[PDB]
Amino acid sequence: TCPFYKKIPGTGFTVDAFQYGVVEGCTAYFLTHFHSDHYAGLSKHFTFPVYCSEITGNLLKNKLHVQEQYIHPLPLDTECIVNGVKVVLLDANHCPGAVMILFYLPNGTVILHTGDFRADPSMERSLLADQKVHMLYLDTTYCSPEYTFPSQQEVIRFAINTAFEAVTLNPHALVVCGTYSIGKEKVFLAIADVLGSKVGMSQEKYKTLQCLNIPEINSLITTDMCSSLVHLLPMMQINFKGLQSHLKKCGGKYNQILAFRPTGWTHSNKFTRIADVIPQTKGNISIYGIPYSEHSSYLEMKRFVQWLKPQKIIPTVNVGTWKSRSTMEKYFREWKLEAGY
Numbered sequence: 001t002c003p004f005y006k007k008i009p010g011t012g013f014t015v016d017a018f019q020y021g022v023v024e025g026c027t028a029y030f031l032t033h034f035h036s037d038h039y040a041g042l043s044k045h046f047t048f049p050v051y052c053s054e055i056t057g058n059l060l061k062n063k064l065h066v067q068e069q070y071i072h073p074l075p076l077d078t079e080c081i082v083n084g085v086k087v088v089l090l091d092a093n094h095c096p097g098a099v100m101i102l103f104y105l106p107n108g109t110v111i112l113h114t115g116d117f118r119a120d121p122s123m124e125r126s127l128l129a130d131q132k133v134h135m136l137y138l139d140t141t142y143c144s145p146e147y148t149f150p151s152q153q154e155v156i157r158f159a160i161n162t163a164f165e166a167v168t169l170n171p172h173a174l175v176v177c178g179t180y181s182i183g184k185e186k187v188f189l190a191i192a193d194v195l196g197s198k199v200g201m202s203q204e205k206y207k208t209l210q211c212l213n214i215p216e217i218n219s220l221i222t223t224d225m226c227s228s229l230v231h232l233l234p235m236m237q238i239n240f241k242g243l244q245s246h247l248k249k250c251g252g253k254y255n256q257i258l259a260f261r262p263t264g265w266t267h268s269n270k271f272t273r274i275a276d277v278i279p280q281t282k283g284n285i286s287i288y289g290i291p292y293s294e295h296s297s298y299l300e301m302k303r304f305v306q307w308l309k310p311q312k313i314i315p316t317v318n319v320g321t322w323k324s325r326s327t328m329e330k331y332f333r334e335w336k337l338e339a340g341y
C-alpha cells in the first residue's frame with residue numbers, strides 16, 4: 001500500500017507511486033525522474049495517465065515501452081491544468097529530465113514536491129519567488145551536517161586535470177568511467193572533451209543517452225569502442241578484477257587503466273579536500289572515487305528551506321527509522337528558530 005508521503009491531499013494525484021498496484025482514488029500518476037526506486041512498477045501494460053517531463057517521457061516510451069497514448073509530457077516553467085488543478089514543473093538540478101512539481105490546490109494551499117534535487121540559489125529566481133508555499137515534500141537524503149561535498153564544478157576540474165595529465169604522460173592509457181543509472185554524464189563528457197575523443201559504450205547505454213536532449217550528442221558518444229579512449233562500463237565492473245578483464249579485451253592497444261567511480265558522499269569527505277584525493281592502485285590499474293553529488297548537501301538544503309519558509313515539511317527520504325525521523329525534525333526546528341518563520 002502506498003505511503004502517505006506519496007499522496008497529494010485534495011487532489012487525485014500521487015508522486016513516484018507505481019509499485020503499489022491501482023492506488024485507490026488516483027486519477028493521474030506523476031513521475032519526477034527516471035531512477036528505478038521512483039519508476040518501480042511501470043511497463044508497456046500500464047494504462048493510467050503519467051505526467052512528466054519531455055525527457056522522462058522519451059525514456060518511458062523507448063526503455064520501458066510505455067504506450068504513447070498514456071504519456072503526458074509537460075513543458076518546464078509553464079502553468080498547466082491537470083484534471084482541474086494548476087501545476088508547474090521546475091528543473092530539480094538532479095539527473096536529466098528530473099523535476100520538482102508545484103501544485104496549486106483548489107482551496108488555496110500551495111504544495112512543492114522536490115522529487116530528488118540538488119538545491120541551488122538559482123532556484124530562488126524561478127517561479128517559486130512569486131507566491132507562498134504552505135507544504136514542502138523534501139528530498140532529505142543528506143539531511144545531517146556531516147554531509148559536506150564540493151561543487152560539481154570543482155569535482156569536474158579535478159577529473160579533467162587528472163585524466164589529461166595521465167594520458168599525456170602515457171598515450172597508451174585507457175580511461176574508464178562507471179555508470180548504472182542516468183545522471184552524472186558531465187564526468188565522462190568533460191574527460192572525453194579534454195582528450196579529443198568520443199565516449200564508447202554498449203548499445204543499451206547509447207540508446208539511453210539518445211533519449212536525453214543533450215546538444216550535439218551525436219558528436220560526443222559512440223558504440224565503436226575501438227575508436228574511443230574513454231569507455232563506459234557498469235559500476236559493478238569498476239574493481240581490479242573487472243578492469244583487468246576489460247584491458248585484456250582491448251587487444252594490446254592499451255597498457256594502463258585510469259578509472260573513475262562517481263559516488264555520492266563517502267566518509268573520506270569528513271577529512272580530505274578534493275585537491276588531496278588519491279586513487280587505489282594495483283599494478284597498472286588506478287581507481288579514483290570522486291564525490292560528484294546530484295543531491296543537496298546539508299548546507300545547500302538548509303539555505304533553500306530557510307529561503308522558502310514553508311509552514312510544514314514532509315521528508316521523503318530516510319523515513320524508515322525513528323532515529324532518522326527524530327534527527328530530521330530537530331534540524332527543521334533549528335532552521336525555523338534561527339530564521340524566524
Ligand code: NI
Nearest residue numbers: 033035094116
Ligand atoms: Ni534519483
